Amino acid sequence: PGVQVETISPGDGRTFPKRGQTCVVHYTGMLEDGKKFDSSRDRNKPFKFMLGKQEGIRGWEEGVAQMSVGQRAKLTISPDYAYGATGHPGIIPPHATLVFDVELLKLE
Ligand SMILES: CCO/N=C1/C[C@@H]([C@H](C)C[C@@H]2CC[C@@H](O)[C@H](OC)C2)OC(=O)[C@@H]2CCCCN2C(=O)C(=O)[C@]2(O)O[C@@H](CC[C@H]2C)C[C@H](OC)/C(C)=C/C=C/C=C/[C@@H](C)C[C@@H](C)C(=O)[C@H](OC)[C@H](O)/C(C)=C/[C@H]1C
């Protein structure tokens, strides 16, 4: 409900990120039925982060944790699992549902 994870291409079905593990991903984020606000693909540089230890929005952490290595997935994140009633001023409006197209490339 807070985050829906829908497969674009399956992963290995077996290797999922552990809390504290470094995840290497490509992503594109857009406002649902609106504008693209960020893409690591457009920078040709994958995004690395430590799941849990480097805190992200709830739907990102819980959505990526549900993915296995190699998986590409559409994450639809409700505002309560994203930036909420305040949004992220200047970038994400109040009460925004977010879509991320995420590909889990590697776990380090
Ligand atoms: C994963 C963890 O990494 N996330 C990050 C940002 C995250 C969100 C802003 C964080 C707050 C934390 C507090 C909670 O209260 C807030 O709740 C409302 C959420 O962003 C996201 O969660 C999502 C999902 C991942 C891709 C980016 N993202 C977006 O929405 C965007 O696409 C956006 O364009 O990203 C961009 C921002 C705007 C979004 C719409 C991302 C931004 O660019 C230039 C980048 C890459 C910034 C990097 C900062 C690094 C700083 C370090 C010193 C330390 C760092 C590792 C930490 O440890 C921090 O702690 C102490 C914290 O951990 C941070 C800042 C992690 C970064 C890597």
Author numbering: 0 to 107
Task: Please give sentences taken from the publication describing this entry.
Rapamycin alone has low affinity for mTOR. It is the rapamycin-FKBP12 complex that presents a complementary binding surface for the mTOR FRB domain to assemble into a ternary complex. Here, we present selecTOR, a chemical-genetic platform that restricts the activity of a rapamycin analog to specific cell populations through targeted expression of a mutant FKBP12 protein. This analog has decreased affinity for FKBP12, rendering it ineffective at binding and inhibiting mTOR, but preferentially binds a mutant FKBP12 with an expanded pocket, allowing it to selectively inhibit mTOR in cells where this mutant protein is expressed.
Rapa*-3Z once again emerged with the most favorable combination of potency and mutant selectivity, inducing the FKBP12 V55G ternary complex with an EC50 of 11.8 nM and the wild-type complex with an EC50 of 639 nM. The asymmetric unit contained two protein molecules which aligned closely with one another (root mean square deviation [RMSD] = 0.3 Å) and are each bound to one Rapa*-3Z molecule. Our structure aligned closely with a published structure of rapamycin bound to FKBP12 (21) (RMSD = 0.4 Å), an indication that the modifications did not significantly alter the overall protein fold or binding pose. In the wild-type structure, the C-32 ketone of rapamycin points toward the F46 and V55 side chains. In our structure, the added ethyloxime moiety extends into a pocket created by the V55G mutation. We see that this substituent clashes with the wild-type residue, preventing the binding of Rapa*-3Z and leading to its selectivity for the mutant protein. The mutant structure also revealed conformational changes to nearby residues Q53, E54, and W59. Q53 and E54, which make up part of the loop that packs under rapamycin C-28, have rotated and swapped positions in the mutant structure, leading to a closer interaction between the alcohol on Rapa*-3Z and the π-system of E54. We also see that the indole side chain of W59 rotates in the mutant structure to meet the ethyl group of Rapa*-3Z, helping to fill the void left by the V55G mutation. Taken together, these observations show that it is both the creation of a larger binding pocket and subtle restructuring of the surrounding region that allow FKBP12 V55G to tightly bind Rapa*-3Z.
